[PDB]
Amino acid sequence: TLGPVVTGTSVIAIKYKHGIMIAADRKASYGSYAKFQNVERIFKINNKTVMGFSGELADAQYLHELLTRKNINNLSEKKRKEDMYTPQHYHSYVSRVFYVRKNRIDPLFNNIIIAGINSQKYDNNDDNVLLYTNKNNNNEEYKEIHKDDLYIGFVDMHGTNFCDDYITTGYARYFALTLLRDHYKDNMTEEEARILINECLRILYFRDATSSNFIQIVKVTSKGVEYEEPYILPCVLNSADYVYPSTLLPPAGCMW
Amino acid sequence: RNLYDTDNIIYSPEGRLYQVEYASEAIKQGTCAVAIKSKDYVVVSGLKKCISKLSFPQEKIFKIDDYIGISMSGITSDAKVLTKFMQNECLSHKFLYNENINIESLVRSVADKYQKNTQKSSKRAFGVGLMIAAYHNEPCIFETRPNGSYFEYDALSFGARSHASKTYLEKNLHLFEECSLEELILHCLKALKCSLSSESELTISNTALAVVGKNHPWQEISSLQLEEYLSKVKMDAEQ
Numbered sequence: 001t002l003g004p005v006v007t008g009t010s011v012i013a014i015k016y017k018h019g020i021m022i023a024a025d026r027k028a029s030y031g032s033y034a035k036f037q038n039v040e041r042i043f044k045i046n047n048k049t050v051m052g053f054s055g056e057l058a059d060a061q062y063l064h065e066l067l068t069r070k071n072i073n074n075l076s077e078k079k080r081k082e083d084m085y086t087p088q089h090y091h092s093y094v095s096r097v098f099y100v101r102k103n104r105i106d107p108l109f110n111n112i113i114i115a116g117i118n119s120q121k122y123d124n125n126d127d128n129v130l131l132y133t134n135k136n137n138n139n140e141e142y143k144e145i146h147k148d149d150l151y152i153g154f155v156d157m158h159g160t161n162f163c164d165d166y167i168t169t170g171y172a173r174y175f176a177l178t179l180l181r182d183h184y185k186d187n188m189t190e191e192e193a194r195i196l197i198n199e200c201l202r203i204l205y206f207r208d209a210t211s212s213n214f215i216q217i218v219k220v221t222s223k224g225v226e227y228e229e230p231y232i233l234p235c236v237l238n239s240a241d242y243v244y245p246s247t248l249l250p251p252a253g254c255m256w
Numbered sequence: 257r258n259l260y261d262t263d264n265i266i267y268s269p270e271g272r273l274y275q276v277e278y279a280s281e282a283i284k285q286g287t288c289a290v291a292i293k294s295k296d297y298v299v300v301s302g303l304k305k306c307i308s309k310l311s312f313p314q315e316k317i318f319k320i321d322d323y324i325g326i327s328m329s330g331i332t333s334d335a336k337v338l339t340k341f342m343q344n345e346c347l348s349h350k351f352l353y354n355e356n357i358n359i360e361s362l363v364r365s366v367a368d369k370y371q372k373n374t375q376k377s378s379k380r381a382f383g384v385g386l387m388i389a390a391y392h393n394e395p396c397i398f399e400t401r402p403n404g405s406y407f408e409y410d411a412l413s414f415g416a417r418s419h420a421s422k423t424y425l426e427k428n429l430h431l432f433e434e435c436s437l438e439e440l441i442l443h444c445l446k447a448l449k450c451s452l453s454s455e456s457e458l459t460i461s462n463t464a465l466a467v468v469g470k471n472h473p474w475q476e477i478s479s480l481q482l483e484e485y486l487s488k489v490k491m492d493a494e495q
Contacts, residue, residue: 082393083358092353 004056004109006030008041009210010170011052012200013115014184015150016193018142019221020115022050023197025204026230027212028057034212042216046071047125047224049087049116051094054169055157059108063094072131081126087116091153091161099159111169112155116220119149123222136223143222147186171208176200190219198233205235265377276374279330279381279402286329288415288451289316291387292425292432292444293395297469299437299444300389302327303415303451304462316464317476321346323356323391325466325474329415330384338386341369359392363406371404385414391468413447420450437467438485441477445489458486 006028013022028036042052043064051067053060067090074085091114101107120126122143152167154160166184168177179200188196194217204211213233219226237243249255260266261274268274289302304313317327320342328335345365349357366386373379381402388398397409411429413421424447432443445465449458460479463486468474477485 077361077364079360080393083360086355089353089355092355096352 001056001059001107001109006036006057007210008039008054008057008060009208010054010168010172010176010204011041011113012166012168012172012176012180012197013052013113013152014166014180014188014193014197015147015152015186016188016190017144018190019117019145019219020050020150020152021190021193021197022052022113022115022218022220023201024052024054024216025201025212026214026216027210029210032209037212037214040216042218042227043067044218044225045087045090045114045116046074046084047129048084048118048220049090049114050218050220050225051090052113052115052169054111056109059110060112063097063108063110063112066097067094075129075131078126078129081120081124084120084126084129086118087114087151087153088118088163090114090116091151091155091163094155095153095159095161098155098157098161102157102159107157109157111157113152113167113169114155115150115152115167117145117149117222118151119145122149123224125224136226140223144187145222171204171211172200175203175207179203201233202235205233206237263377264374264380273374273403276381276403279383280385282383283330283385283402283414284416286384286415287314287316288413288418288421288448289327289329289387290411290413290418290421290425290444290447290451291327291389291397291409292411292440292447293389293397294432294435294437294440296395297437297440297467297472298389298391298395298397299440300325300327300387300464300466300468301441301444301448302464303448303458304464306462313462317466319474320388321356321390322473323468324359324362325389325468327387327389327464328384329387331382332384334382334384335386338366338369338382338384342366356392359388359390359396359398363388363398363400366400367404367406370400370402374402374404387412387414389466389468389474391470391472395469411447413451415451417451417453421447424450437469437472441465441467441485442489442492445485446493449489449493458489460486 008028011024024041026039028039045067153163154167166180205213215233216230217228260268264275287303287305291300302316304316306313319325346357374381386400390396397412400406411425460482465477
């Protein structure tokens, strides 16, 4: 790849009391043209790990393929649930791929988020992994996962990598991150986490031209990786001055 | 003349690979080593070969990684090549993934290194066996053979006249699980002593002993501690 052509905009991932909540609008744009409006941008790596991306879609699909087969081979050698690769392992692997490609001046034009649960003590999902069946879609309750057992990593084009309690990509690094550094807190419930993520996505919808309001939410919890039903985010303007007709303003001068 | 034992790629009419079996035969000629494990610990003990009076004893056990060590029997240079390979695999895994390698994967890679040397006429099998002791979520002992097979054990011994040590280990296998680290060390040392020649003894010079466990990185035992353990073994052997 020589530059972005088809791109996704921004991803938000935060720890809350039951695991990881990661969000991305389902949009991939061809420049300023919103060609694809139903694109999946958060992928499941294993029952405890997800991958989100911004930037070029083809590079993201390549990386998703790499990780899919890495998880398959991991399962091929597994003899106990502890053998499954952690989110930290996948974050290291992706950071390494990016570093190697930087040294060749051949990067993937992506920013990546690797998030998940960094422990095996909260459930027995990795005892019998199902690649092609999902049993969630039984009537059990989520386990509270200690923040230290959760992992959210970031990788950029130059191989810069780090972890934190909340990670953002793209325009979320300005709009969402400001509100998160102001307002995020530990052990949030699903309701509070969802409310904060929705506020961030609403600001992005109002201020990022590449964004959309069709939001995909994914959760990684004691029940595994869960894709929520995509939903349209209601975004109303926050001032009546926007809606005031121009003809009611003075006709003279630069009134617009 | 066998007529089938000349090349390493030739099966005999009975379906055997004689060159590989000879490489295994090289293992029985080495000095004895014993590995045993409790619920939390693996203890490795082996005899250090001494060439003559003025010579220093040969090294028997080697550190591979923080929580992995090995003992070997057979051709020393082969063991050194394998030791370098394992150390490099572990360090490269730490470098790439920032975590300690999975011991099963490392042992499988070692066994595949073994296997690759048996399928071409221009190679020979490694003429050495590796006893591998690690703690990765649990204590573990592995063995690797020249033919490319590996096995996990609860107690293990090989080398010259290791059948006596094996007899001792089979006898007391039931005990090892629940016994303390001191008791486990005494058991390993007594099993090793069971392989001794008539006139020989176990001394700080000729005895290699390492422990590795839950909070206990691979560590050889010092001369003072080793001497106290050997004295305890002698005294409770007199009984």
